[PDB]
Design a binder for this molecule. Structure first.
Ligand SMILES: O=C(O)c1ccccc1NC1CCCCC1
Ligand SMILES: O=C(O)c1ccccc1NC1CCCCC1
Lengths: 158, 157
């Protein structure tokens, strides 16, 4: 129905969507200001890690400091094949994408990293309150020259 | 308030109920969950150590995979289920946890728990593609398999 309440929702979703698009398109030196898309207490980071705990960077300033590390370790990164998923919550979006670029981790050789990613974006007052990255860490191991364990699934059909 | 829209609301409402069903299926009822797919529907695990998905294609093969699944994960349950509707009436995401016993040939019996994202794409009110995404490292752990530790050396605190 056409109500101002439903209109508010649409406008919120629409404004939020444009921020997701901006996030996912941010490259190079622009990455250093991408923290400004977050709430002051906003959280970002990697939720699928070998340790099992997330790497959660908390706060708009700590996120800016994190961008400096990210830009050196992933200097030429690009997200590709971006699919943005609005949800029934005008403040909650999912993104399915790929990404590729060099990976430069001290104590490993320079590598080429490619992976499939899912990102979660939750909003508050039109800024990002919580960004979470989900990927398969095994592809990151490969990129680092780290041997990947193999699970044998005997009986799996076929 | 067009029929165009009503049609989709209907599809989305219908499809959401099938996502709820899938996610709430336990026990012996797992052996018939393949029936919620299209005849040519695909399900399986998209985050593997090998880097390639384990994709099970067709209702028949899915029904066969359920027998495997019920042996290897005899008491599996999904919890903390959050279902996300999308702008596409035939596309849902689910974020959830899951846990249960893991009983694979050649590994010690373990307790497996993980965080999961599932994608469900529909055709004609049935599941045309279901995809599970998780962290394979937690499954390694469940089986006693060593997980390497990635060092991120100048990562700020
Ligand atoms: O992949 C990582 O090691 C990682 C660590 C903390 C935060 C995010 C991380 N993932 C991003 C780093 C920049 C884009 C490519 C992957
Ligand atoms: O986790 C697995 O090894 C697996 C392999 C093929 C298809 C699906 C898989 N994951 C499901 C198996 C059934 C219990 C919950 C996780």
């Amino acid at each position: 129905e056409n109500t101002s309440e439903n209109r508010a929702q649409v406008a919120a979703r629409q404004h939020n969507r444009k921020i997701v698009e901006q996030y996912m398109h941010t490259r190079g030196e622009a990455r250093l200001k991408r923290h400004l898309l977050f709430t002051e207490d906003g959280v970002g980071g990697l939720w699928t890690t070998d340790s099992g705990q997330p790497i959660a960077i908390r706060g708009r300033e700590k996120l800016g400091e994190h961008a400096v590390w990210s830009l050196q370790c992933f200097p030429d990164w690009v997200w590709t094949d971006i699919q943005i998923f609005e949800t029934q919550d005008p403040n909650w979006f999912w993104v399915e994408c790929r990404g590729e670029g060099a990976i430069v981790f001290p104590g490993y050789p320079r590598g080429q990293y490619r992976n499939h990613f899912l990102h979660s974006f939750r909003f508050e007052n039109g800024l990002i309150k919580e960004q979470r990255e989900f990927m398969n860490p095994c592809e990151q191991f490969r990129s680092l020259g780290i041997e990947v364990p193999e699970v044998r699934r005997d009986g799996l059909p076929s």
